[model samples]
Target chain A: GRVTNQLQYLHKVVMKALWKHQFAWPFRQPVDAVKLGLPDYHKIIKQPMDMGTIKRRLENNYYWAASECMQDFNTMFTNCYIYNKPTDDIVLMAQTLEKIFLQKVASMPQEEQE
Target chain B: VTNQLQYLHKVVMKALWKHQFAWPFRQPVDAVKLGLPDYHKIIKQPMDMGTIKRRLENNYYWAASECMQDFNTMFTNCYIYNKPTDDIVLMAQTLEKIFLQKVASMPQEEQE
Candidate 1:
């Protein structure tokens, strides 16, 4: 439960950081399909600009963002804490942390990426 | 025979083919062995399998081929991402090891 809370907090912080950066161009479009003129944006976007394509692209972007943040998180955990943990403890902790992040991603609001 | 391994092999073959035709390399293996050295040079040191797996899992490999493509993107986008200088080399080596392990795990008949 502690790890889950940690992962949630981490995800929130990372998402906020990304939002502040305003680099969500392509990912945000799908969520803003109509507002951005999806068809027009689709012309320049690598993938087709349809609703389904936009959603998938957004999801992939979220996955990539989460993965990037989690990579550093795992590294920090191993270097700073897990070295002293038992093997079973380490694996379980790692696996649980992963599951928590994934579930969080899955549960995110449809337009949250926008 | 596992779906994941099969998907990995398919994508690797596609990458090899693309490289062979786009570049001067006659074979995918040659392209990987030769073309990758410069890319690998970016990494400070080789990463162990455990680290690589953790990274990959963090990234998610549900779409296996996407994982390979993402690996390529990571190398290309290293600067933008502010990734550790040696990260690409570590990732490239990790991809190779994962592919090789999958290949080795195949039954002889299936391999053929």
Candidate 2:
């Protein structure tokens, strides 16, 4: 219940953040990875992006927990090298917002049930 | 003029956060070199223990941002990372407090 509410809240908030602020990220292609001097995902995963694994992490597990959140958030933000030109500021800003939202939701009175 | 004052403040604040939070990270050297399964340093620069040369580059940059009152206070009190440790929670708390301070500063006309 907490996660459901959290997810819903995040979806709304993130979208709002993007809309309210004129912050638009540039689009980088995977093929352009070499230009940015990034790593290759094939060597790491030995498979595709593994959407199933990610789904499980968020749907079945508490992906927001500090430890797990790092790995998941890192991958989501960076796209495991699929994205070229890593935007550190953007990454940090997104993570900060997510963390802030979670803290707010957790502190709510109804957090126990929803 | 703003950058000079802002830079000075960041220098002081970043040091404090790094010292106070004990947050650590790692870097994948030549993350661009590895290949086979997934991309090297794809999602992130790769997870490392202690500090790597590559890791230090961004770590210090971030530390500077987190601590500096001017820049930290200037931004929307948004923007942080989910570190590889319990520091993730620490990051949130710091940002939350930073947000409050920023709001306080915003009300001060001297900010101009």
The per-model lDDT (C-alpha) reads: 0.34, 0.33
List model 2 lDDT by residue over B1-112, tens digit each.
2332243235423433354442422222233353324333334323322332233334443432222323222222212222223343344345434333332222111121
Whose DockQ is greatest here?
2
DockQ of each: 0.03, 0.05
Report the CA-based lDDT of candidate 2 relative to the real structure.
0.33
Taking the tens digit of each residue's C-alpha lDDT, what string does model 1 give over A7-102? 343345433433333223332233353774545433322222222342343344433332333443333222212122223343334333433333
lDDT of 2 at A63: 47
- Per-model B-chain TM-score: 0.25, 0.28
Candidate 1 lDDT score at position A57: 34
* Model 2 lDDT per residue over A73-99, tens place: 333433332222335554454445434
Write candidate 1's Cα lDDT for B30-110 as tens digits.
Answer: 226545554444433232323334544464455443443333333222322222334543454344333333322222211
User: Lowest summed lDDT over 10 consecutive residues: which window, candidate 2 chain B?
Assistant: B103-112
TM-score of chain A of each: 0.27, 0.33
User: Model 2 segments beyond 4 Å from truth?
Assistant: A1-3, A19-73, A80-112, B1-112
